Amino acid sequence: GSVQIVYKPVDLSKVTSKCGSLGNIHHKPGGGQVEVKSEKLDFKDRVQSKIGSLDNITHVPGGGNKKIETHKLTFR
Amino acid sequence: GSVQIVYKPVDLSKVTSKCGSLGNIHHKPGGGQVEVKSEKLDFKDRVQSKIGSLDNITHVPGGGNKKIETHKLTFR
Amino acid sequence: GSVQIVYKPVDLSKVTSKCGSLGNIHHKPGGGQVEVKSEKLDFKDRVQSKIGSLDNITHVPGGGNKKIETHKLTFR
Amino acid sequence: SVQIVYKPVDLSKVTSKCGSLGNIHHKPGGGQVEVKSEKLDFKDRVQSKIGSLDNITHVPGGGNKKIETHKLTFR
Amino acid sequence: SVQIVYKPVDLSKVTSKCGSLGNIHHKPGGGQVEVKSEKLDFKDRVQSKIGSLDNITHVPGGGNKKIETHKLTFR
Amino acid sequence: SVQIVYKPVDLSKVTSKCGSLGNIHHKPGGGQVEVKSEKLDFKDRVQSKIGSLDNITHVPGGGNKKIETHKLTFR
């Protein structure tokens, strides 16, 4: 027999912001004092090692708003 | 017999922000003193090691609003 | 016999912030003193290790509003 | 056969925070002022100030001294 | 046969923060001033100031001294 | 047969932050000033100032001294 599928989601979303000012953002991390002492360091497969390292991100978008949509129709 | 599926969700969502000001944000972490003493360090499969390291994020979106929708129709 | 499914949820929702000012936010963690003494450090399958390290996030959205929807229809 | 290791670590923080600093919505409000002066005689030095609001932060203090003397004498 | 290692580490932080600094929505408001002067006689030096608002940040202070002396004498 | 390793490490920070700095929405406001003068006699030096707002940042202070002296004497 007949199968009829009418997939028509309707989207009039508003995702919005107003910011009067962004400013005076100070990302100033400071490293310490670090010592590693050994007869050997022995690192093998997919070892990740950070010694006294800095990983720094400053992210300051004026909006930074997101709208994520997934639409799926599976007929089987 | 006949199967009829009508999928029409209606969406007039509002996600909104007003901010008069963002500022004076101070991300200033400080490392200490770290000592590792050994005869060996011996790291194998998928070891993750951080010694005295700083991983630092400042995220300051003026809005930062999110909307997420998943729509699924499965006919089986 | 005939099957009819009508899926039409209607959404007019409002998610909203008003803020006069965000500011004077001070993320300033300090490390101490850490000592690890050994004959060996010996790490294998998916060991995660942190000695005297800092993981630091400041997240300061002017809005930061979220809306999440899942719509699912399963015919089987 | 002597070994000497002289390795002091100074991670120290010295800080002064003086005056106003972290204030939010500070709103000092001077009222109306009126001065009416008639027939005043001054026979010596005059110093005068008139006004609605003095909003002063004055900091002759604060500020820092670090002194650290390091000496190694082997002899 | 002597070994001397002289390796002091100075990571030290010395900070002065003096005056106004991190204020948010500071709104000092001087109201109305009126001065009416009639028939005043001054027979010596006059110093006069008139005004609605003195908004002042004045810092003779703050500022820093680091003195750090390092001496190694072997002899 | 003597070994001397003189290697002091300076990573130190000396900072002065004096005056106004990181203010947000600082809005000083002087209201109306009126001065009316009649028949005033001055027989010596006059100093006068009139105005709605003085908005002064004045920093004779701040400033830094670093003095670090290194001496290695073997003899």
Question: What's the 3-state SS for chain C?
Answer: CCEEEEECCEECCEEEEEECCEEEEEECCECCEEEEECCEEEECCCCEEEECCEEEEEECCCCCCEEEEEEEEEEC
**Is E9 an interface residue toward A (CB < 8 Å)?**
yes
What is the number of alpha carbons within 13 Å of residue F55 lying toward its C-beta?
Answer: 13
Taking the C-alpha atoms of residue D2 and residue E3, their distance in angstroms, rounded to an integer, is 6
- Exposed, middle or buried by CB within 10 Å (0-12, 13-18, 19+), for B27? buried
Dist. CA F44–CA D17, nearest whole Å:
45
Asked if A34 and A52 touch (Cβ cutoff 8 Å), the reply is yes
Q: Is C2 exposed, middle or buried (0-12, 13-18, 19+ CB in 10 A)?
A: exposed
Q: How was this structure determined?
A: cryo-EM
Reported structure resolution in angstroms: 2.6
Instruction: Verify whether the Cβ–Cβ distance C52 to A29 is below 8 Å.
Output: no
Contact E23, D28 (CB under 8 A): no
Which whole-number Å values give the CA distances from B72 to C73, D63, F56, in the listed order?
Answer: 6, 65, 64
Q: Which residues pair with A27 in a beta bridge?
A: B27
Q: Are D72 and E71 in contact (CB under 8 A)?
A: yes
Cβ-in-10-Å burial (0-12, 13-18, 19+) of F72 comes to middle
Report d(CA B3, CA A3) in Å as an integer. Answer: 5
- Report the candidate in A69, C67, A19 with the shortest Cα–Cα distance to residue B66: C67
**What residues form DSSP beta bridges with B41?**
A41, C41
Query: What one-character DSSP code corresponds to residue D44?
Result: S
Q: For residue A43, count CB atoms less than 10 angstroms from its CB and return exposed for 0-12, middle for 13-18, buried for 19 or more.
A: middle
At a CB cut-off of 8 Å and minimum separation 6, what does E9 contact?
A33, D7, D8, D9, D10, F8, F9, F11
- Subunits next to E (3 or more Cβ pairs <8 Å) are A, B, C, D, F
CB D4 within 8 A of CB E74: no
Record the tokens describing residue E21, joined without a space. 């600094």
Residue C24 contacts D where some CB pair is shorter than 8 Å: yes
Q: Is B38 on the interface with E (CB under 8 A)?
A: no
**What phi and psi, each to the nearest 5 degrees, are found at residue F52?**
-75, -45
Q: Which helix (H) or strand (E) holds A6?
A: strand A3-7
Contacts of range A62-65, beta carbons closer than 8 Å, 24 or more positions apart: A62/A19, A62/A22, A62/B62, A63/A17, A63/B61, A63/B62, A63/B63, A64/A17, A64/B61, A64/B62, A64/B63, A64/B64, A64/C61, A65/A15, A65/A16, A65/A17, A65/B15, A65/B61, A65/B63, A65/B64, A65/B65, A65/B66, A65/C63
Three-class secondary structure of residue F4 per DSSP:
strand
Contact D43, E43 (CB under 8 A): yes
Contact with chain F for residue B4, Cβ under 8 A: no
DSSP state of D29: B
Nearest-CA residue of chain E relative to D24?
A: E24
Annotate D14-49 with b (16+ C-beta within 10 A) or e (fewer): eebebbbbeeeeeeeebeebeeeeeeeebeeebeee
C-beta separation of A40 from C40 below 8 A = no
In whole angstroms, give the CA distance from residue F71 to residue E71.
Answer: 5
Q: A26 has which bridge partners?
A: B26
**Structure tokens that stand for C38 in this block:** 């050994």
| Pairwise CB contact (< 8 Å): B29 & C54 | yes
Residue E71 three-state SS: strand
Measured CA to CA, the distance from residue F8 to residue E5 in angstroms comes to 10
The CA distance from B48 to A55, in Å, is 15
Tell me, yes or no, if B21 comes closer than 8 A to chain F by beta carbon. yes
C-alpha distances (whole Å) from E61 to each of D55, F21, F66 are: 19, 16, 17
Which chain B residues touch E9 with a CB distance below 8 Å?
none
User: Taking CB atoms and an 8 Å limit, are A38 and B42 in contact across chains?
Assistant: no
The one-character DSSP state at D61 is -
Alpha carbon E70 to its chain's center: 31
Answer yes or no: are the C-beta atoms of A23 and C25 closer than 8 Å: no
Q: Is some CB atom of chain B closer than 8 A to the CB atom of F13? A: no
Are residues E19 and D16 in contact, defined by beta-carbon separation less than 8 angstroms?
A: no
Which residue in the block uniquely carries the two structure tokens 């499914």? C5
Q: How many residues does chain B have?
A: 76
Q: State the Cα torsion F6-F10-F11-F12 to the nearest 10°.
A: 150
Strand intervals (E) in chain B: 3-7, 10-11, 14-19, 22-27, 33-37, 40-43, 48-51, 54-59, 66-75
Tokens 């800080």 belong to residue: D15
- Here the tokens at position D4 are 């000497």
